[PDB]
Design brief:
The complex is a heterotetramer, with 2 copies of chain A and 2 copies of chain B.
Chain A lengths: L29 H15 L7 H9 L3 H6 L2 H16 L4 H13 L11 H13 L4 E2 L12 E4 L18 E11 L2 H4 L8 E9 H5 L5 E8 L3 E3 L1
Antiparallel strand pairs in A: 1-3, 2-3, 2-6, 3-4, 4-5
Helix pairs in contact in A: 1-4, 1-6, 2-4
Chain B lengths: L12 H17 L5 H14 L3 H12 L1 H9 L1 H8 L9 E5 L4 E6 L8 H4 L9 H7 L3 H7 L9 E6 L5 E5 L11 H6 L16
Parallel strand pairs in B: 1-4, 2-3
Helix pairs in contact in B: 3-4, 4-5
The chains are: A alpha+beta, B alpha/beta.
The complex binds chloride ion (2 copies), cobalt (II) ion (CO) (2 copies) and magnesium ion (2 copies).
């Protein structure tokens, strides 16, 4: 989707707010810590999201004005909400009522519950991860060193094909293997793995800037054509 | 709110806080979450992981050439062997800075960063200014961080558009002769493993 | 500039808030009326802006978060402020102090002053307008029916070359004449007029959508190349 | 405000109101503006101009074929002759809807609209939803307004990227036989002269 999230090559966002690393604190509010627990906790159990594709599209669907003002873990709360409601794990009215409860009385206490077996389960995701690498029967369309032209496509659903890289010549750097395909998996349509490539693009091609810069981008096979 | 313009009004940050508590409470009540599951995660990402893991990798590469060569030839196998593997670090690639090649990593589309190796990303790494600009004007962006590269150094920006993750191996600075591996690791900054800074001689 | 203003082809902004025309009121607050008076009033006297190019870049320079939340005449106040300060008509601190005065006491009264000769002057702009059509000695590079390819350029200053139309084949529909060139005029660099074209682009070319849609866009000569 | 994140906090609309009054006050004090200059402008755009001017043009075109033909051959000359000329209407072009061609006008980059002929643009015309979407999915956008065109009607979207301005001449509906020019003009809606609606039979 050609959304506010897809910012590569945009102007106007201003200076980078540098902070020394030792001063760059991770969390300033407890709800931000909760957001982390919510995303990992749900994903570890396949609730609302089996991997990151579903997680990402829920963020990309945010109102642009919310995406830019929520703060980072605001996006995580937005996607958790979105995907739990969409899969039927949570009822939308029930969740709105309860939000309102905590809005009006932010000292309302969260129920406590101890489940060590769930802790184990969550530890597994943390340490075992969720590798999207699959095997498929087809052979790669493209080979290392090949010059390709990326497509001019405009998926209205989730994609990992950034707009700045569309309709551009590049050169295959590496054939990774076949990875779960985000444009499908984000919408719960099957892993449908496709070959994933690393592709190098020259500044002159991306921007028309003749200079010694390049960008390396991982692109699924269907984002590209042979020349 | 004029109903012609609901989009001009953002949710206040109090809304997201409220919603976070509501989701936590409903999920615990429905048996989908627990106090200790949430705390285990928080403990892992706020305390257990961090850029010291990558610093150890970098110091080892500087002190052991056979390891460095193995790491660059097959980082996923090497990193997994060391235990730096897990969620959002299942496939980690190491990209070597050299005298004429400087590497900088970004997630233009979001925030993708290899937690098992480097911990949580910088605040700025997730925000639009760095994400928008680094792929197009990386020299300008690097100058903001105090890295002013000559025109003849090539910059390679790596956009983390898949689940593949990238860590920059920065070069060992001058002035470090006879330091131990452990001492060298303390010099490795998080920012150097993203590519926004070189390492200063001590 | 590849900014938040350049929205053509973006996803995620949602439904169009239709209102019947007779219900679609022009102004809900007096400061919005003031904004209109400010823009026309200054432009009529060449203050901060000689035409619309300088006006537009001041809006495009807004913080994206402000551009999306200010409301429409917020953009006009932003550009008036920007251009008066930039040209030295207004001092930035003097203007910030006075803003703060009205913020804390929004009932502070605005000084009154009657100047009929200025009213005349303003009437002239309203009725005579500010046509950018000029004559130049050069001949047009392109002709009606010619197939052109728009450039892949990324001006960091003002441009009227929308991102969705970049690096696209199109067909010259009309040669208007030479018009003041925005990419220069917006930054006070001279009218430097260039031939202006109307160009038709097919949906299939812009979006990869095979369907019976087209877009007609006015592009200055320097945005394009011959095939 | 965490200074890492000043960009998450918009100026409140009270800020823009304050700033508007400050600019008005300073400019009046410095002799660059006057109460009556501001009021003249407001009067012109809130009251003097409006879509009735274009409606009169459309009704004339429907009732006088020689005028319609002149208008389509050289609208700038014709419109200027009628007096519909001025700021942001120095170069106005008229685009004719036909049975198989439907025209829709936008300013993707901002809000450009021919004030001397049509008055101020709709609220929605200036906002991102219409501007983003109309050039890419005009059929979907038109359906939102209640215009559902068959696949065989071609849509031409006109993006007002220069100072050239566009007005749509909608077709006269059925059911209007023997109405006068003045009566026909009252049927012409603003939305029809943008291209987001056809005119309903009365
Ligand atoms: Cl280095
Ligand atoms: Cl019509
Ligand atoms: Co990311
Ligand atoms: Co406009
Ligand atoms: Mg990647
Ligand atoms: Mg135009």
């Amino acid at each position: 989707m050609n959304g506010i999230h897809d910012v590569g090559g945009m102007d106007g966002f201003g200076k980078v707010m540098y902070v020394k690393e030792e001063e760059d604190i991770y969390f300033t509010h407890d709800w931000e810590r909760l957001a982390f627990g919510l995303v990992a906790g749900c994903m570890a159990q396949g609730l609302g999201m089996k991997a990151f594709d579903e997680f990402r599209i829920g963020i990309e669907l945010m109102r642009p004005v919310d995406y830019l003002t929520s703060s980072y873990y605001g996006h995580w709360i937005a996607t958790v909400a979105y995907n739990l409601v969409d899969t039927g794990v949570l009822d939308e009215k029930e969740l709105d009522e309860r939000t309102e409860v905590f809005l009006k009385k932010p000292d309302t206490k969260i129920p406590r519950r101890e489940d060590p077996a769930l802790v184990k389960l969550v530890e597994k995701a943390l340490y075992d991860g969720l590798s999207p690498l699959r095997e498929i029967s087809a052979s790669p369309r493209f080979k290392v060193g090949e010059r390709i032209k990326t497509k001019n496509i405009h998926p209205t659903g989730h994609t990992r094909f950034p707009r700045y890289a569309r309709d551009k010549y590049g050169v295959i750097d590496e054939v990774y293997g076949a990875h779960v395909f985000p444009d499908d998996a984000a919408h719960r349509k099957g892993e449908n793995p496709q070959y994933l490539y690393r592709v190098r693009f020259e500044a002159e091609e991306l921007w028309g800037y003749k200079q010694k810069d390049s960008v390396y981008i991982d692109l699924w096979e269907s984002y590209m054509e042979p020349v | 709110i004029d109903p012609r313009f609901p989009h001009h009004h953002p949710r206040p940050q109090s809304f997201w806080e409220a919603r976070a508590k509501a989701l936590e409470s409903l999920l615990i009540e429905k048996g989908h979450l627990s106090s200790d599951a949430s705390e285990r995660v928080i403990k892992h990402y706020e305390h257990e992981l961090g850029p010291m893991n990558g610093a150890k990798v970098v110091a080892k590469a500087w002190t052991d050439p056979a390891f460095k060569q193995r790491l660059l030839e097959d980082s996923e196998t090497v990193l997994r062997e060391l235990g730096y593997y897990g969620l959002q670090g299942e496939h980690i690639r190491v990209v070597e800075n050299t005298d004429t090649v400087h590497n900088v990593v970004v997630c233009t589309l979001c925030s993708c960063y290899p937690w098992p190796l480097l911990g949580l990303p910088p605040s700025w790494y997730k925000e639009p200014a760095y994400r928008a600009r680094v792929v197009k004007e990386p020299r300008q962006v690097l100058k903001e961080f105090g890295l002013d590269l000559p025109d003849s150094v090539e910059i390679r920006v790596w956009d983390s558009s898949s689940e593949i993750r990238f860590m920059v191996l920065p070069q060992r600075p001058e002035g470090t002769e006879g330091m131990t591996e452990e001492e060298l690791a303390k010099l490795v900054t998080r920012d150097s493993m993203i590519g926004v800074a070189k390492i200063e001689p001590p």
